[PDB]
Amino acid sequence: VVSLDKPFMYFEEIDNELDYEPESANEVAKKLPYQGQLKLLLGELFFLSKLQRHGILDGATVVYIGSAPGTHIRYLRDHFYNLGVIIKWMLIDGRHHDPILNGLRDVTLVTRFVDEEYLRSIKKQLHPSKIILISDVRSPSTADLLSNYALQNVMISILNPVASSLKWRCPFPDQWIKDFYIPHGNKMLQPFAPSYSAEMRLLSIYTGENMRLTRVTKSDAVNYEKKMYYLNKIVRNKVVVNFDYPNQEYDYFHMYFMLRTVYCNKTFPTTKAKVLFLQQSIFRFLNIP
RNA sequence: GAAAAA
Ligand SMILES: *P(=O)(O)OP(=O)(O)OP(=O)(O)OC[C@H]1O[C@@H](N2CN(C)c3c2nc(N)[nH]c3=O)[C@H](O)[C@@H]1O
Ligand SMILES: Nc1ncnc2c1ncn2[C@@H]1O[C@H](CSCC[C@H](N)C(=O)O)[C@@H](O)[C@H]1O
């Protein structure tokens, strides 16, 4: 057990490190059904609420590349829809999207794997709409990663979004090829990720027609492995005794801090009240008990 | 990276 004031929201805040134990991969990584779908929903709800909070979400077109099956996206769509927000969703991916996204007047399902030219095409057919970028592409070896990151960067250059959420999982230091550059932004830690995932999300709001790239070296690669391992093995594997809530596991503690930033069209007397409600609807919708 | 029942 443990007593915590608040969970580690952004990577930079992970106070300790632990050298990766390869035996870890032999442990079960998914404890509940549709864990990934849940993990995606919370991060997106969270980022998209920071957007709502800034007044960047209404009238925007959310381009989610690498969106299949996207089961959780229908919940996101209904959410802001019921909130009164105007959003236009364009889901592009070569894999088939969940049937519950069909015929939705405000979502565009596009079956196709994205590339440079197709970015110019969607940018074209979208402008002057304010684009919000969400990537989740994954071709997995470092080569694949570096490739996906080369695309994620040009997605920003071509699409020129006003804000973006990228998939960010640094190459393990033992399979390193070379150094690369990534956009600058807040590295958001996500709950309900696989037990020993090193994946976090790079959230960034653009000043306008801007960006900024930062270098990543093998030394950085080692720091990630160290910090992330510690977070997964220790921190996440704990029960927060000072967390007044049915489930007191770290991930739920962390989700309570994510879920409390999201807006709802109904009135709630307390944060825990709203949190209980949102978690309920999400879990029931996703069929997670 | 995602991955109910069957
Ligand atoms: P996601 O983005 O978290 O998932 P992905 O499938 O890309 O990678 P993951 O399962 O984490 O890793 C695949 C294999 O690589 C070794 N791992 C995992 N892991 C967290 C980790 C590994 N190796 C080193 N050096 N350091 C790490 O931090 C295992 O063989 C996994 O099976
Ligand atoms: N160049 C590319 N363009 C678009 N999607 C791509 C891509 N390369 C890989 N992908 C897609 O990226 C996805 C990674 S997993 C995505 C899970 C999805 N976001 C969810 O909500 O369920 C895969 O479905 C893969 O088909």
PDB file of N, CA and C (backbone and C1' of nucleotides) in Angstrom, chain A residues 30 34 37 39, chain B residues 1-4:
ATOM      1  N   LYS A  30      -2.530  -7.301 -19.438  1.00  0.00           N
ATOM      2  CA  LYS A  30      -3.891  -6.813 -19.573  1.00  0.00           C
ATOM      3  C   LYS A  30      -4.731  -7.516 -18.499  1.00  0.00           C
ATOM      4  N   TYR A  34     -10.786  -4.821 -23.007  1.00  0.00           N
ATOM      5  CA  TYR A  34     -10.751  -3.538 -23.681  1.00  0.00           C
ATOM      6  C   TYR A  34      -9.952  -2.500 -22.928  1.00  0.00           C
ATOM      7  N   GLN A  37      -8.619   0.270 -25.265  1.00  0.00           N
ATOM      8  CA  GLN A  37      -9.706   1.177 -25.647  1.00  0.00           C
ATOM      9  C   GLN A  37      -9.999   2.178 -24.525  1.00  0.00           C
ATOM     10  N   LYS A  39      -7.802   3.028 -22.056  1.00  0.00           N
ATOM     11  CA  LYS A  39      -6.596   3.848 -21.948  1.00  0.00           C
ATOM     12  C   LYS A  39      -6.626   4.998 -22.953  1.00  0.00           C
TER      13      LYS A  39
ATOM     14  O5'   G B   1       2.001  -0.231 -26.667  1.00  0.00           O
ATOM     15  C5'   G B   1       1.232  -0.991 -27.568  1.00  0.00           C
ATOM     16  C4'   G B   1       0.449  -0.151 -28.515  1.00  0.00           C
ATOM     17  C3'   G B   1      -0.826  -0.902 -28.565  1.00  0.00           C
ATOM     18  O3'   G B   1      -1.653  -0.434 -27.430  1.00  0.00           O
ATOM     19  C1'   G B   1      -0.087  -0.554 -30.802  1.00  0.00           C
ATOM     20  P     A B   2      -2.658  -1.441 -26.697  1.00  0.00           P
ATOM     21  O5'   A B   2      -3.910  -1.546 -27.753  1.00  0.00           O
ATOM     22  C5'   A B   2      -4.966  -0.587 -28.010  1.00  0.00           C
ATOM     23  C4'   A B   2      -5.886  -1.111 -29.093  1.00  0.00           C
ATOM     24  C3'   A B   2      -6.503  -2.446 -28.755  1.00  0.00           C
ATOM     25  O3'   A B   2      -7.694  -2.337 -27.945  1.00  0.00           O
ATOM     26  C1'   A B   2      -5.580  -2.681 -30.826  1.00  0.00           C
ATOM     27  P     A B   3      -7.705  -3.251 -26.595  1.00  0.00           P
ATOM     28  O5'   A B   3      -8.267  -4.656 -27.064  1.00  0.00           O
ATOM     29  C5'   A B   3      -9.574  -4.793 -27.646  1.00  0.00           C
ATOM     30  C4'   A B   3      -9.645  -6.024 -28.528  1.00  0.00           C
ATOM     31  C3'   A B   3      -9.329  -7.294 -27.843  1.00  0.00           C
ATOM     32  O3'   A B   3     -10.457  -7.929 -27.267  1.00  0.00           O
ATOM     33  C1'   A B   3      -7.958  -7.251 -29.720  1.00  0.00           C
ATOM     34  P     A B   4     -10.389  -8.393 -25.746  1.00  0.00           P
ATOM     35  O5'   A B   4     -11.950  -8.514 -25.449  1.00  0.00           O
ATOM     36  C5'   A B   4     -12.700  -9.650 -25.820  1.00  0.00           C
ATOM     37  C4'   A B   4     -14.017  -9.591 -25.153  1.00  0.00           C
ATOM     38  C3'   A B   4     -14.808 -10.830 -25.338  1.00  0.00           C
ATOM     39  O3'   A B   4     -14.477 -11.717 -24.270  1.00  0.00           O
ATOM     40  C1'   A B   4     -16.092  -9.210 -26.196  1.00  0.00           C
TER      41        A B   4
END
